[PDB]
């Protein structure tokens, strides 16, 4: 059983509590889309872990890659350079856009923006910073300051030069411009405000392609060339934070590249590391010779170290060879419409957004008043899981609750219909 | 050789550049207490890489580990337990002193402090945070606030509440109460300024136990226990960094164990990773019990991940076994001596301090001025590479540079003889 | 001559530039509605000086006050109370509304904000400060941190906790809400993204009733009570400044009459000294004892003094007897007709706004674009000079320029029609 | 009598609280040295009320000259210049040091400091300002943040960047270099420090020749040059707060004469006005040309104010004739011998210090402890009080009461002696 009690007790003692609540099971094992429980009961990991298992877990080759590695190559003095490091660098730099030549290769998503933020703050001059109002950045100093989904409040002071604008949101339009939603003068009207405010010292903006834990926000289009306009009239660069949308999972190998607007900066995480700990930053020569003249500097203990490099280049073998980022376009074709069958037949779903294999489902009580659905999330949750279907809700202030569903790129057929039905029958017994 | 120019090309062209300057050679692999460049040459590393190799690279035992669960268990939802996460916690608790229950398993040493300065700031209702002139905390937000050996300039305001007190160092000793060094009216002179500066809101205090980038500064003697009263006295909390201290390296399993003070938040890092990326922080449960109830919240996408967990539990087991923390005194004793017939050879030397195995040799022009030795470091860290022995030097204000010494807790007798000599060598050949 | 070349000589070489251009005049002597250059010409005085001689220059009354004090009592040490004193707050508190209750007696504008910003803080245990985006309330530290409407670059960061809002501008909508401008809606989705910005610490609102440098930004129908309870539900204060507006200058003794919200905390300055330097707080009892216990302090050189109190009193009763605050009314009815026939004639004028003896006209390009007039303004001002009238415009960004119009309460029929006539004559000289 | 319940009553109930407790009398007039109250008492004013009647009360000329004034030229518009201003200016360019060259004219001593420090913050392009721990700048913003002896607490965080150092306090040293009281390594120990926290933007340093309100500390010798040479080094600018001292107090006109070291903006307040709020700023041309060209703003409703520049130019011409600077050596050299009288007879008094008429009397418990007198210091000022003499004490932490003396600079042979003997017997009835 999953109800070991000498395991409950220790963890009941000994660990902290970080946000959430423990689910009440297990993990013996995991593989593929699935993760096992101390009983061998499967459950469908249709949300890829933390949004990072783009190839699915103990994916073979990361196995093999680990085990080379760990034997031969683990970590380095951090000015000792290698070659998983050099070839990752390089990797990246080709596989980004034009215009994005220099890697820099970390652990985590949150250090990977820190690195960012730091060196526009560097490049500029300046310190002010400008995020969405529901958007997720980490939680570590400045990538807190800029996350404003979450955990703003009890924790003193945020960063000097903080600011938020509002992101634009099709499902709950708010701004209105001559009859319709004005995202654009939404956007111009943000910016406004931000110029009032603003000690002349505007350094960067960070943007998600579309803010995950905001609620699956996708930008609306001719947004972010907008934006990165309003970036380039006053100087400041723009920072993607791709770490759950990159590599593949949204059906181009990184979002920038379906807007056709090249960031200033690229963050990347999750997926790059496709559950171990690796995160790097992409930026411009220019930007990086700049900031080498200026004394830039971000050293860790573990920045260029031999193993996440060598994972890492893997990940991106594997996406690349057996065509993932066409197989998240096709997959995510075929979850898309399985989920609009499901808002078909239950009133509770008020939309379904997303991309590729990263789409969302807006719970709420009724279409008309698209009424949150006070709750009603949290039991079709605790139903999926009965039936062995791990899903992840997120709720925000003046929304209704969003299911995450981000299955592996390696997703079969068969597991998504799987899983679309597990749904199906959670909803069911849910109302 | 290790001049293989399309390695060179890729590199200049495709790395960002994060402080100091790439050694010019590729390490092709390591083992032991090696590291071998593209040539075979076996170079001797005497800093355990970033200091974190404790048990040297690919240590079998954790190549073992990292097999069994690449192919088992690899990463989860943050909200799913695991084993080797609750035995981890556990372990953790057992091995900390008294007042050390509750654990939260993190990936870098800048992300477990900004963990546990974001927990006090939680816990107290308060946002000044106190450091040492001469730290080293991590490059993210708030882990750079509390850092002040480097990176303060240029890169924007630091966080509000950051006071910085000087560091008692007995080498070069600043403040005097009646003929003599005394570093406790310093402190209290110290703790007078800061009083008065304070809004009213101190919250925490971060301290290494032996500054290792601010020049291997050991605190004296009754410093800590003196110190923890001073922060008692005002609410404040006190949070070890054990990162390049924890795990056996001092000869005793945390430093905090010597001076018998126990901190209320205890951060551990490199020598838990042993070269992974793992780190935690270790509370009590009361303040983890308040932290709780106020709402506390540190999620990541790593944290409580089944693979570093695993990784960790072995560094620690093996630790245990092989009674490393014990071999970390012999051993380290066998150094010292070594350097001190070092000192008595050659004028340069001018200090040699630390503990265990994290061994401090501070060069100078001169003993009677103690005069610091402009550039006669980079030749002797240089002498040293081409024989074959990996030093690093740190170089601060009014200080002469000094070299930080930490072996493998797993050196052999020759090894340390071995490099003894090399360092000989290096420095006959450098005046 | 006004030319005086010994003059311009030593001030051009002895004084300070602190914005704008000085006039290229020297003031002999100043009585009622005028002030005299060296050559003896009469420029009418329209703006009441810096928008402060409610009573005119050398009011007959002001110079007995001031005379009866200066030779009896001046200035006492801020422990001693005096008569004036205890007069002036008692008359503050009976002609304020209801729930005004206790007075603060300082010095200037500035100062009195910051006293009532400062005990905002200490009785709400918070620090974030909310204001328009084109606000005035002083040059000192906290006045200056929400002031938006100028001087907020190249002077270092502002105040922590710094926000600001659009200011609802009727003359150029920006926010609509299905059709038409929804003020209220505006401020509904301004609060929505400070909310989304707090750090859980909202302290207060401040703002002008009419926002004098913003361009006479008049608050809209049923604003205030909208605001008013935006604050209340956040637990935040609301500071009402009617430093331009308190004393009948627009037709109430204080312009949160009209509205009938009555502040948490009013601050008054210019109109209270009528020239001199006098300024105060006023608040409610409960607030202040609050304020008390917590040990509020607002300790100055002159708070309290005999001199100031003294001459406070006498504006008020002056205002009192004479019923200036229903001539502003009338005369105020008198100048805005002049103005809306000047609009007929001329299409430069694109708008004419404000209460009372608190006017507004703004220069527009022409009427359907309402394009500003780019340095029309200047030329109209030029004019009006040459002709003795003295004007101010006001111009911001994406507006037009403003002239601010405002006489003393104690205007004649006759210099109203004189300046009335000066205006049209420049303007007619100056396209 | 002082009892008047109704003026009580309206006095509880009317008047907010701002520090301190009022005195229990009605004042209900004052002249030269004394002030009356409602009972015809005459109370000798020994701290020039709030430390500012510099020629005492209602000084038959200050009285002309209001009175010319107040019914030829009030209040201008702040762009209208006119005579008392250009020639206060002027004049004041002339009396101070060289190097001083322009004036602009304000009203308070914390607006005049607001002022200074926002030039210096344009002028450098930095924003860090360094103070000391028990200096006294005003309540606004910015002179609040670097105000450290008291008000720091409680209301919210202070400006970013704001640093104390110690004061160089000789009556109770605390650094000590080889056997003595070093006050210059003192100094260099508290400056390196510094040096370790700036961000790279220190702007100013802030600096009262004398702590008033921290207890009359006096700055030794050669320190203010050796403080301006660590400013000079860093490229920091000095401001100097001679609101206290300025005006002949200590003996000269301005104490930065004694020292010989002028400062880059020099300060003046409270004694520039005898009484009224008139306050100034005196810089170099450089700076001041820098800060116009860098667009320096800081416009008022008082700044240039015919009657205050007036009142000011003719405190000037007064101690200018009567020779009050030197009046205010020989007065305090009698003063100071009949304290040192006064310290022969009773043990408590453990200090005498000050200059001119700028003297401090330190309460204490017994000479060799040097243990504070716990609310003697109370008794003593009951005492005086009853006597008729008013007495001003502050007492701060590790810090006996100080009696802060300073009688007006026209105090008479015969007010002096008797001060002296009410002292006397206070003293004498209160152990
Ligand atoms: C998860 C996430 C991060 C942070 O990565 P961590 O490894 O959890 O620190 C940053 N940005 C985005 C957009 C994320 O989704
Ligand atoms: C190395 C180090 C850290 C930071 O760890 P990273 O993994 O480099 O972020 C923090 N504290 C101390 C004392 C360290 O030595
Ligand atoms: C003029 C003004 C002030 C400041 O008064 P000063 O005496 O100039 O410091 C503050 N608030 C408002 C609304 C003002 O118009
Ligand atoms: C009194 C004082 C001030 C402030 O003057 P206020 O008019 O009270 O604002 C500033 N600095 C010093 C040194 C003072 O003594
Ligand atoms: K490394
Ligand atoms: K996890
Ligand atoms: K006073
Ligand atoms: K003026
Ligand atoms: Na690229
Ligand atoms: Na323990
Ligand atoms: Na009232
Ligand atoms: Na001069």
Redo the contacts with the bound molecule.
């Keep these: 059983l999953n109800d070991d009690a000498t395991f409950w007790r220790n963890a009941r003692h000994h660990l902290v509590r970080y946000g959430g609540t423990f689910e009440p099971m297990i993990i013996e094992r995991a593989k593929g889309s699935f993760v096992y429980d101390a009983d061998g009961r499967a459950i469908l990991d249709f949300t890829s872990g933390?949004?990072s298992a783009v190839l699915g877990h103990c994916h073979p080759e990361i196995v093999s890659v680990i085990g080379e590695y760990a034997g031969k190559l683990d970590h380095l003095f951090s000015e000792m350079l290698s070659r998983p490091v050099v070839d990752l660098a390089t990797r990246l730099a080709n596989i980004t856009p034009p215009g994005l030549d220099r890697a820099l290769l970390l652990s985590?998503?949150?250090?990977?923006?820190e690195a960012a933020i730091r060196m526009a703050k560097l490049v500029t001059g300046k310190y002010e910073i400008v995020g969405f109002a529901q958007?997720?950045?980490?939680?570590?100093g400045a990538?807190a300051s800029a996350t404003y989904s979450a955990g703003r409040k009890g924790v003193g002071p945020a960063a000097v030069g903080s600011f938020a604008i509002p992101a634009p949101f099709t499902y709950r339009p708010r701004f209105e411009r001559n009859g319709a939603y004005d995202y654009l003068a939404e956007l111009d009207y943000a910016f406004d405000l931000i110029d009032r405010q603003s000690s002349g010292n505007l350094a960067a903006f960070i943007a998600?392609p579309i803010l995950?834990?905001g609620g699956i926000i996708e930008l609306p289009d001719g947004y972010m060339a907008a934006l990165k306009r309003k970036c380039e009239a006053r100087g400041m660069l723009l920072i993607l934070?791709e770490?759950?949308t990159g590599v593949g999972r949204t059906g181009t190998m990184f979002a920038c590249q379906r807007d056709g607007v090249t960031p200033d900066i690229l963050?990347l995480?999750?997926t790059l590391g496709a559950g171990l700990?690796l995160?790097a930053i992409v930026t411009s020569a220019a930007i990086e010779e700049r900031a080498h003249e200026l004394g830039y500097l971000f050293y860790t203990t573990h920045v260029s170290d031999p193993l996440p490099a060598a994972v890492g280049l893997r990940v991106l073998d594997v996406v690349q060879r057996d065509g993932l980022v066409a197989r998240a376009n096709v997959m995510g074709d075929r979850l898309r419409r399985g989920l609009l069958d499901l808002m078909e037949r239950f009133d509770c779903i008020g939309d379904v957004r997303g991309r590729g294999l990263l789409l969302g489902v807006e719970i709420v009580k009724d279409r008309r008043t698209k009424e949150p659905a006070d709750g009603l999330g949290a039991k079709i949750t605790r139903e999926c899981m009965n039936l062995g279907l791990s899903m992840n809700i997120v709720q925000l202030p003046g929304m209704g609750g969003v299911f995450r569903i981000a299955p592996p790129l390696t997703v079969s057929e068969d597991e998504i219909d799987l899983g679309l039905s597990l749904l199906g029958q959670a909803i069911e017994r849910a109302l």
């Design positions: 933390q949004m985590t998503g949150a250090e990977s923006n958007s997720w950045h980490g939680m570590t990538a998600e995950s834990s934070d770490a759950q963050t995480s999750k700990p995160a």
